[PDB]
Design an enzyme around this catalytic site. Structure first.
Site, short mmCIF file in Angstrom:
data_model
loop_
_atom_site.label_atom_id
_atom_site.label_comp_id
_atom_site.label_asym_id
_atom_site.label_seq_id
_atom_site.Cartn_x
_atom_site.Cartn_y
_atom_site.Cartn_z
N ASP A 67 -2.16 0.30 16.49
CA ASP A 67 -1.25 -0.50 15.49
C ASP A 67 -1.60 -1.94 14.44
O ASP A 67 -1.13 -2.59 15.02
CB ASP A 67 -0.19 -0.16 15.51
CG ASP A 67 0.37 -0.11 14.22
OD1 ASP A 67 1.95 -0.40 14.12
OD2 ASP A 67 0.61 0.42 13.33
N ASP A 92 -3.08 -0.75 7.55
CA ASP A 92 -2.03 0.30 8.71
C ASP A 92 -2.88 1.32 9.37
O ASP A 92 -2.87 2.52 9.20
CB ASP A 92 -0.92 0.28 8.61
CG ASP A 92 -0.07 0.34 9.38
OD1 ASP A 92 1.63 0.69 9.59
OD2 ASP A 92 -0.68 0.13 10.87
C1 LIG Z 1 3.19 7.35 11.30
C2 LIG Z 1 3.69 7.16 9.52
C3 LIG Z 1 3.02 8.78 8.70
C4 LIG Z 1 3.77 7.85 7.58
C5 LIG Z 1 4.34 6.74 7.16
C6 LIG Z 1 3.92 5.66 7.94
C7 LIG Z 1 5.32 4.40 6.90
C8 LIG Z 1 4.32 6.04 9.37
O1 LIG Z 1 4.21 4.75 11.01
C9 LIG Z 1 5.25 4.99 10.89
C10 LIG Z 1 5.48 3.79 11.96
O2 LIG Z 1 5.67 3.20 12.13
N1 LIG Z 1 4.47 3.17 12.03
C11 LIG Z 1 4.64 1.41 12.86
C12 LIG Z 1 3.89 2.31 14.09
C13 LIG Z 1 4.07 3.38 14.40
C14 LIG Z 1 3.27 4.77 14.93
C15 LIG Z 1 3.92 5.88 15.46
C16 LIG Z 1 5.13 5.35 16.07
C17 LIG Z 1 5.42 4.01 15.65
C18 LIG Z 1 5.53 3.53 15.44
C19 LIG Z 1 3.12 0.41 12.45
O3 LIG Z 1 2.50 1.22 11.75
C20 LIG Z 1 4.28 -0.13 10.73
C21 LIG Z 1 5.91 -0.28 10.37
C22 LIG Z 1 5.56 -1.47 9.78
C23 LIG Z 1 5.36 -0.72 7.91
C24 LIG Z 1 6.18 0.64 7.77
C25 LIG Z 1 5.56 -2.31 6.84
N2 LIG Z 1 5.67 -0.81 11.83
C26 LIG Z 1 7.03 -1.30 12.21
O4 LIG Z 1 8.27 -0.50 12.16
C27 LIG Z 1 7.48 -2.68 12.59
C28 LIG Z 1 8.26 -3.39 13.63
C29 LIG Z 1 8.73 -4.48 14.79
C30 LIG Z 1 7.98 -5.34 14.14
N3 LIG Z 1 8.62 -5.97 14.22
C31 LIG Z 1 6.61 -5.24 13.44
C32 LIG Z 1 6.74 -3.91 12.72
#
Ligand SMILES: Cc1cccc(C)c1OCC(=O)N[C@@H](Cc1ccccc1)[C@@H](O)C[C@H](CC(C)C)NC(=O)c1ccc(N)cc1
Length: 329
Positions: A34, A214
């Site tokens: 990620d 991302d």
């Molecule tokens: C899988 C998916 C599908 C569609 C849309 C989205 C947004 C998505 O993704 C879901 C998701 O949660 N993705 C995260 C990775 C993830 C994937 C699957 C399950 C859990 C986490 C990561 O790639 C993205 C996010 C931030 C953006 C939304 C701005 N990270 C934090 O929340 C974060 C937390 C703590 C920190 N100190 C820093 C960052």
């Protein structure tokens, strides 16, 4: 050359995973790699929630290099929460190992039922240090500091369902993965791998939109307002309540997203963002796009973008390089 290549495994063009190990005994785990977070976490052997049931668990007592920390951490993604404590142990990525601070997770209730219905064990963040809980120096920056890699950069060659596997490559850029030029876009901040691009689709245009590259987002995200403007009269239907936009796979009205800088123009035609193809009944397709609003208009260039474009994440030069990915290895 050299470089540390970690093979990526595809799951129906929705998700992809990669393996890494923890402990001097190299206990194996499957991770979400990620670029949108900055912490590594694996479920502990001391985890008994239902989510932990089917997972590869980490046993610190089986590793001599383990160093106790214990500081409690609650890891809050937009997707859910996992909690545990910090631990230090050897982490192995590809053919390289280094001592590393990670989160040993003991409670995944706040990540269920998602975790229960997942094949991955944990998440491995690849963002910048300031995006982390615990001020953990990025794995790639460390390896570089320790002289194990050529450059403090990594690249993503995403697997394409059916056509080929992918690779997370640490330490250098391999031409085998892309064609045409590699254009760099400067990070606007050392947090997410976020750059500034003008976004355009059809008539609408959003000047200097913040775009987060991302690997951990499986869709393209668009500010809702912009999304509202592009769906007007497109023969694209929103299933209410749920984030699904569906359309005939042959809907000729479907637009190409265009992201531009003075250095390059990156596009995403309908074939890159339409999931399905020969679905329920006729040829219904769903758009792998959802609306999502940040404080300032942002696009998350998630997997559908990275599947088309080879990407380079450069810590030394604080930039993201983008190139057309080679169709096949
Ligand atoms: C899988 C998916 C599908 C569609 C849309 C989205 C947004 C998505 O993704 C879901 C998701 O949660 N993705 C995260 C990775 C993830 C994937 C699957 C399950 C859990 C986490 C990561 O790639 C993205 C996010 C931030 C953006 C939304 C701005 N990270 C934090 O929340 C974060 C937390 C703590 C920190 N100190 C820093 C960052």
């Amino acid at each position: 050359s050299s470089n540390d290549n970690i093979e990526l495994v595809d799951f129906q063009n929705i998700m992809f995973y990669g393996d890494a190990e923890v402990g001097d005994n190299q206990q194996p785990f499957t991770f979400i790699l990620d670029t949108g977070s900055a912490n590594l976490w694996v479920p502990s052997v001391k985890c008994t929630t239902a989510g932990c049931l089917t997972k590869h668990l980490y046993d610190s007592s089986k590793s001599r290099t383990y160093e106790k920390d214990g500081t409690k951490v609650e890891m809050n993604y937009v997707s859910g929460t996992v909690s545990g404590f910090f631990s230090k142990d050897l982490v192995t990525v590809g053919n390289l190992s280094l001592p590393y601070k990670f989160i040993e997770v003991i409670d995944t209730n706040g990540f269920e039922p998602t975790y229960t219905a997942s094949t991955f064990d944990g998440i491995l963040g690849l963002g910048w240090k300031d995006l982390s809980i615990g001020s953990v120096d990025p794995i790639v920056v460390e390896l570089k500091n320790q002289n194990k890699i050529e450059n403090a950069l990594f690249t993503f060659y995403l697997p394409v369902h059916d056509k080929h596997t992918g690779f997370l490559t640490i330490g250098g850029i391999e031409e085998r993965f892309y064609e045409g030029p590699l254009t760099y876009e400067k990070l606007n901040h050392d947090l997410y791998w976020q750059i500034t691009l003008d976004a355009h689709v059809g008539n609408i245009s959003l000047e200097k939109a913040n775009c987060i590259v991302d690997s951990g987002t499986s869709a393209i995200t668009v500010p809702t307002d912009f999304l509202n403007k592009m769906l007007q009269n497109l023969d694209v239907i929103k299933v209410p309540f749920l984030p699904f936009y569906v359309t005939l796979c042959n809907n000729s009205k479907l637009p190409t997203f265009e992201f531009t800088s003075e250095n390059g123009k990156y596009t995403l035609e309908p074939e890159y963002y339409l999931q399905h193809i020969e679905d329920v009944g006729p040829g219904l397709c769903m758009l792998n796009i959802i609306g999502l609003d940040f404080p300032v208009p942002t696009f998350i260039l998630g997997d559908p973008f990275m599947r088309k474009y080879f990407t380079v994440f450069d810590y030394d030069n604080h930039s993201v390089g983008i190139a057309l990915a080679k169709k096949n290895l």
